[PDB]
Symmetry: D2
Subunit: 355 residues, 4 copies
Amino acid sequence: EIPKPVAPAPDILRCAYAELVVTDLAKSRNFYVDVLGLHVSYEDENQIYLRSFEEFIHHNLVLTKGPVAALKAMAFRVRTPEDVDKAEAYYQELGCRTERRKDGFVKGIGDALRVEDPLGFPYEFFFETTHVERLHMRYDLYSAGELVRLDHFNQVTPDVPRGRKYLEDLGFRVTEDIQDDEGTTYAAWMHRKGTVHDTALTGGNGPRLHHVAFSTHEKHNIIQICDKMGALRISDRIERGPGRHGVSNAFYLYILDPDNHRIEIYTQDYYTGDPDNPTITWNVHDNQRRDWWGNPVVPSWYTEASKVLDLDGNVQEIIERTDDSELEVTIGADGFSFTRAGDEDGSYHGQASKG
Amino acid sequence: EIPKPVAPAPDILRCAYAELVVTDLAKSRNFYVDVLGLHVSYEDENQIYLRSFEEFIHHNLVLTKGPVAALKAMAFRVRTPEDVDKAEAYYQELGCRTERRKDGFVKGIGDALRVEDPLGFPYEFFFETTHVERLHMRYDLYSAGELVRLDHFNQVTPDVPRGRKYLEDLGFRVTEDIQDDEGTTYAAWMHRKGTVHDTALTGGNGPRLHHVAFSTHEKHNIIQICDKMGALRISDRIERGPGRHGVSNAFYLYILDPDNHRIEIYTQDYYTGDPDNPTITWNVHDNQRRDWWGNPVVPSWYTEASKVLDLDGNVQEIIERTDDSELEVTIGADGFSFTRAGDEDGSYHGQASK
Amino acid sequence: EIPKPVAPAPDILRCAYAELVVTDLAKSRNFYVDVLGLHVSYEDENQIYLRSFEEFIHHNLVLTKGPVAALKAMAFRVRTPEDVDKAEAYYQELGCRTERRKDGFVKGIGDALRVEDPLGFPYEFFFETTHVERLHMRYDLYSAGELVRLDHFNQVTPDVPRGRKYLEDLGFRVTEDIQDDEGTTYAAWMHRKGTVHDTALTGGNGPRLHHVAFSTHEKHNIIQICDKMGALRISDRIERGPGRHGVSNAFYLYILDPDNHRIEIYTQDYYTGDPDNPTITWNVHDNQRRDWWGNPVVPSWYTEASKVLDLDGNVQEIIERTDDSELEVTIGADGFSFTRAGDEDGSYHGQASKGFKLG
Amino acid sequence: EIPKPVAPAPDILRCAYAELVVTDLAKSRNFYVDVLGLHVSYEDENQIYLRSFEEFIHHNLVLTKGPVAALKAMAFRVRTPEDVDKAEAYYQELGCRTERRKDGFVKGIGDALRVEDPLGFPYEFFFETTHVERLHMRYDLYSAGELVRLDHFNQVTPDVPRGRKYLEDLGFRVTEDIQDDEGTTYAAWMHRKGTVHDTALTGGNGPRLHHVAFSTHEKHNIIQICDKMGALRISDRIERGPGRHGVSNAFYLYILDPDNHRIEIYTQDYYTGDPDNPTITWNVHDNQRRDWWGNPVVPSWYTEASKVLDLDGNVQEIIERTDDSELEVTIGADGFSFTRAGDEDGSYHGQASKGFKLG
Ligand SMILES: [Ca+2]
Ligand SMILES: [Cl-]
Ligand SMILES: [Cl-]
Ligand SMILES: [Cl-]
Ligand SMILES: [Cl-]
Ligand SMILES: [Mn+2]
Ligand SMILES: [Mn+2]
Ligand SMILES: [Mn+2]
Ligand SMILES: [Mn+2]
């Protein structure tokens, strides 16, 4: 349904940064800098530019003060300056609204193209960026919970197959998905950089941003984030986890920022860079697909997500999913999940796992 | 109201082993050897004797085939042979039924006393045991989920202050407990060996054995047990966790064996060996007391536990707790918990967290 | 010196496998399977095919019985079948000997090109491979020392800049190097897959193979390998480490197989996939460049490496390095190393760090 | 030849704290607080009082400014106030100099006894101490290299059996030792608290203090301390390690403070609280006894140690060891070590393991 342009797709390297609108810059600074330990590349009264421990581009996260908390831009770095031209022609062919600024939208980025994409998301494509001191060996700064890289974005959208075809045309390769036996797709993960993903589509009402994810080196670094949150008596801002994912095989944690923006901490997925990387499809009723240990997924994880803005800074209208709901079919009143396919023992009827 | 005997208490070193009755020995062997990686000290068609990586006594766990799954004995090692005689005099004065076997009840244990204690639990006291190869440097045998020591037992009993005073008289020192402002005690942790505990009392219907706990070296060893259970498609046997405890500060996991005996995997609690070790009391409504990260405690954790046997091998009758229920006051319809004391944000009412 | 062909370079994905010749197959199997825990894809009386925990191609290591222990092939996977044709044309233009086998040189590989490259190394390029069960979530098999991926090769060659230019034309990008203030390059690291490297050049007499490297998930996995070697009373086969590298920032260990092939265990380097990834140059006299903690580099690490074979299976003759020796200028008799640039305190004159001298 | 007193020994709980004299209080503070992350209980211009993450007594380390860097006191906590009286009666019957202060020698300690013991060391015994906030759940403060407990002291003394007999009479139980086949003892480890040790004797010229040891939770915490020292460009202050010990089975690191006082970081030894805990005796020529991975022990580890003070604050005279030297018999020019007992393969003669000789 989204047509494949004649124009060549831009060569996209990876997810690079997100710009998030926040309502209280000081509260958000405390969360991202004092709790999570992200490093400040630049800040003033209106914005905070933050980067992970191993990054050399200017930033991985921009917090911009504004009236309505929302995603303003999800940015991907492209391989060459000429790929920004290619992006612009590609989205024009798709009949999408675009805006190009030779000196960038945010500090530390040069020539950049922002677009309202066919799923209603604000994508940015850029090459030029101000290099900063790469802190990868600054063990004098290293926190027990250190965030080392930006890993991926996750987007909520009502029609996953529609979105998947579009991202595949753009060069993303699907690595894992969740489907049922009746032709419904609930989620898909897709990559450029050779990890399990750079973005993912989660079926639900949208456009909304589900989360932004950062990596740590080791599993104990994620445990430390939880332990620190207990010590600060903000354990209520731990939403889900820590756990092992089924899809992706990564160790994970979901926490909530002061404006409820969801942040995932993630580590130790696998290499997907080969072009015949085997795709893995999970059944939606498999209770090890999201948490490998079978821990229940809290309904807020399925229902809550962040608003996204269009290029004028207004919130995008939400379009309702009409396909089956992953919440309803697994943990709702008529839901079902299994531990072992075909075994009644360890299955759950009309409720979540573990009691 | 259990009287302190005039006879001197035995000098208890530590928790040493449990004897669990299991209904299918082969299934049980799979779980404890093939899944959990415990080391075989002896086996035959009726029993399997198992030890942890760093143990030098004969075993930490005896699995005995029997008709009804139950705890048969929770055993403590005493300091000297003469302490077995002390234990016998002590429990006799308490009015308890005792049985002394000079050659032991199980293989690899010598002179031993088993008793039906004042709380209805089958306790064993022994000194003599057959030493075996201590495997602590056998990294050729080390598993990614390696269980390295036996850490503690946890007992369900209806009146916590009654049992606590009894265990204090026996020389156990309380390290942590959970109470409310009305003065109810819901749980207590107490030690001999200088860790947070050797045994613990959980308020509930009893006597029942809540769990036996083994320790690992590191947190990732516990993660691996979860990951392995996923791969074996037995994730339904993960009951609760993994988590960080409030009480004890240990990283933890609870899993269920084939007869629904609960095993805890545990690491990185703190030193309690000083006699004035500060005792920590948590409020029952504090949602970080059990899981520090505020994860909810599943009802089964409060309501399910193993039967225990008397010295004839019959199941001990159960006494209902009359004091307030921790389940009811925290996650029941009239329950509540808080993240920050006095703050409605982050509080849960008639509802568990998350 | 090595000219850039007009013919386009093949699109190389990653290092994929090495074929090592071994003298006693059972002894080598004991090391790679029983000690290190690699997974057997296939074996017979002549060869063992092994893969890492997360691999889905047929193998990462082939062990082949032969009279003389040596590297027979270092293999790189290319993006498409047509890239194997490109590789053949590209190396033919370079004037190199090449051999094309439509059904592969080893089991589990299809159409494959082997070349004697301009530096004397036996490279293989292929696309087609038999997929196997990817064991990445088989935690029922996971070892305390589990090797999860093949990471890189490291090659000993006398003229590092000559080889560096050749690999750059082939599309490898240099991520780090070691140089001095007098124009000498002692080593360079270069990648295709977006980690610090897929291969590396170490200055010395060559061609010889320095090592093949496998990665683990965490640092404790590497510690466990050491601990297990102690328990098996083969700690004499731990050559160097464990440590933190300066170059690459990875945690590491070097061990020696039964034929003295060196294997590295490696974890937690950083992302290099951006095309303007900053290139890091370390000075050869910086005592934190190889081991970040300043631990001395044992002389065998600089002097010993494996023979490599030509396409006929004969050993390649060794060409002597005439550029300065990293060993000699850092830990030799007239050597020098520093902890802090410009500070005499924490410097070493004519011996290694931490109170040691060359044996 | 130290007789067993008729007076009963005090009941000793554990090692509790050390008082180290340091020459520059600010530079020592940088090391212990800014580099190592210890927690300040009290400080002024003359002294800094430091504790570990899980401690509830007032301190584990007192840094006292003075002209000559040295150990001033190694303190053990006793079980009851009455045990301080017992310590006094015990050491008086041994004919040792004692000094008793009802209000303590350092802040946060009450009634305390210091003695110049039969081996020349300044021991303190106390019960009373000021309790402080136990930081064990303060994960808002927890550093990547967090030191969680004080674990042990290690003493250099010329005659190990003489010292060991005396400590056994004091209630310490030997867990491990190192000996040769001709009856020389090189080192012994001994405990009260149910870990491998609270103190240890290392054969050498003495009295000198070899080190004080702190524990971490996990192995990666020790790795971080090394990594941080590299980042701070003070890797020259990493003396030995990191490694796995043979004796004790603990993961370890040795670093040097600004006055060259040696600090060990240590984790994951085993339980010794049972009274028949099996001893382990290692052969001095076993190259896995100190480092299980066979890494060489730097000569400074055998030769260098801190001065100790008498009760007047003057340095104790040093007595030379007449028994054989562990350095000499293992890594010296006539030394040897083995990987496998009886096997020439993996053995080292007249040099250290891994390819080094003494610097
Ligand atoms: Ca020069
Ligand atoms: Cl998920
Ligand atoms: Cl709990
Ligand atoms: Cl290196
Ligand atoms: Cl040692
Ligand atoms: Mn995610
Ligand atoms: Mn427990
Ligand atoms: Mn390497
Ligand atoms: Mn020590």
